A paper describes a structure:
[name] is a transmembrane tyrosine receptor kinase with extracellular immunoglobulin and fibronectin-like domains that recognize ligands such as growth arrest specific 6 (Gas6) and protein S. Ligand-binding leads to autophosphorylation of activation loop tyrosine (Tyr749, Tyr753 and Tyr754), recruitment of adaptor proteins (Grb2, LimD4, and Vav1), and activation of downstream enzymes (PI3K, MAPK, and GTPase). [name] behaves as a proto-oncogene, having roles in cellular transformation of NIH/3T3 and B-lymphocytes cells. To characterize the active site and regulatory mechanisms of [name] and advance rational approaches toward the development of chemical probes, crystal structures of its kinase domain with nucleotide ligands ADP and ANP and the inhibitor compound-52 (C52) were determined. These structures had good electron density for most residues and revealed the canonical protein kinase fold: β-stranded amino-terminal and α-helical carboxy-terminal lobes.
The ADP and ANP nucleotide structures superimposed very well with an RMSD of 0.11 Å. These structures show that the DFG-Asp motif is in the “in” position, with Phe742 buried in its canonical pocket, forming van der Waals contacts with residues in the αC helix, αC-β4 loop, β6-strand, and αE helix. The DFG-Asp741 is poised in a catalytically competent state; its carboxyl group is involved in hydrogen bonds with (1) a chelated magnesium ion and its coordinated water molecules, (2) the amino group of the catalytic lysine (Lys619), and (3) the amide group of the catalytic Asn728. The magnesium ion is coordinated to the α- and β-phosphoryl oxygens, two axial water molecules, the Asn728 side-chain, and the DFG-Asp741 carboxyl group, consistent with a typical protein kinase catalytically competent state. However, αC-Glu (Glu637), which is a critical residue for catalytic turnover, is in the αC-Glu-out conformation. Although mostly solvent-exposed, one oxygen atom of its carboxyl group hydrogen-bonds with the backbone amide of Leu744, the first and only residue of the activation loop that is ordered in our structures. The side-chain of Leu744 is buried in the interlobe pocket, above DFG-Phe742 and between the αC helix and the β4- and β5-strands; it is also protected from the solvent by the side-chain of the αC-Glu637. High-resolution, complex structures of the [name] kinase domain were determined, showing autoinhibited αC-Glu-out conformations.
Residue numbers in the entry: 575 to 595, 598 to 621, 633 to 657, 665 to 744, 763 to 861
The structure:
């Protein structure tokens, strides 16, 4: 019963336009204890205990859950006016978009996500859906991890092979995300269809090194896709590797 804290009153929520189309995600206004209204995003879909757990997460690189409304469940998240990282990367290759993102900003995006994942990993919370599209830009342009908790080409081999999903599978997905950032938005594995992905990986193939990327960066990405999950580093290792790489630039 005490997990009533996470529940938000339906009349404090005003729903507006669709943002994207399991269920709908909408823009909205949440009335706060402050008297003020906050712009929110609202994803429709036990399940309050996990949401209460997620509500307690508090890190600059992890999206904060505001609460839930219900029997129709909706999760309240802060609206991020700058949107997802994937779209940002792609827009940056176009005029009227952001300017050309230099390597340093790209590496800083990877650090933000790795810090975000280090936090979640320390609390044994699996993300299970990490991709550039589920990484959000704050108003200060720091990145935060989103859409965790509740995509074939972000899924580790052992997880395609069996039902298994660990933090090392999240690590695999972080690797692919790093590649998404390095390539400024390419879909993983050009020329490989989704249904041939398990056989492709089983034969030892991985994402190829982007053209002008440092070997040092590719080394880091690659370590994320080692066949044995135990051979993959932790997020705390990755995080420090990317910090020292960025530092050396
Ligand atoms: N907190 C938020 N603030 C602003 N926009 C958001 C937020 N959360 C999601 N969106 C956007 O709403 C749209 C639909 O969301 P979503 O269902 O997460 O689609 P998606 O990008 O395919 N991610 P997923 O379905 O988790 O793989 C996307 O454009 C999101 O970037
Ligand atoms: Mg998403």
């Amino acid at each position: 019963n005490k997990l009533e804290d996470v529940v938000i009153d339906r009349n404090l929520l005003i729903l507006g336009k669709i943002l994207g189309e399991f269920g709908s995600v909408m823009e909205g206004n949440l009335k706060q204890e402050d008297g003020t209204s906050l712009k929110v995003a609202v994803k429709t879909m036990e399940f309050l205990s996990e949401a209460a757990c997620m509500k307690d997460f508090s890190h600059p690189n992890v999206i904060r859950l505001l609460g839930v409304c219900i029997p129709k469940p909706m999760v309240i998240l802060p609206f991020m006016k700058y949107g997802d990282l994937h779209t940002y990367l792609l827009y940056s290759r176009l005029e009227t978009g952001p300017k050309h993102i230099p390597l340093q900003t790209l590496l800083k995006f990877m650090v933000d996500i790795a810090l975000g994942m280090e936090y979640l990993s320390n609390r044994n919370f699996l993300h299970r859906d990490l991709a550039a599209r589920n990484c959000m830009l704050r108003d200060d342009m720091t990145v935060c991890v989103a859409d965790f908790g509740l995509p074939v080409k972000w899924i580790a081999i052992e997880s395609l092979a069996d039902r298994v999903y660990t933090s090392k599978s999240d690590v695999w997905a972080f690797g692919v995300t790093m590649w998404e950032i390095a390539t400024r938005g390419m879909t993983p594995y050009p020329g490989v269809q989704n249904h041939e992905m398990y056989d492709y990986l089983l034969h030892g193939h991985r994402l190829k090194q982007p053209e002008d990327c440092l070997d040092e960066l590719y080394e880091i990405m690659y370590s994320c896709w080692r066949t044995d999950p135990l051979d993959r580093p932790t997020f705390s290792v990755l995080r420090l590797q990317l910090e020292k790489l960025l530092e050396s630039l």
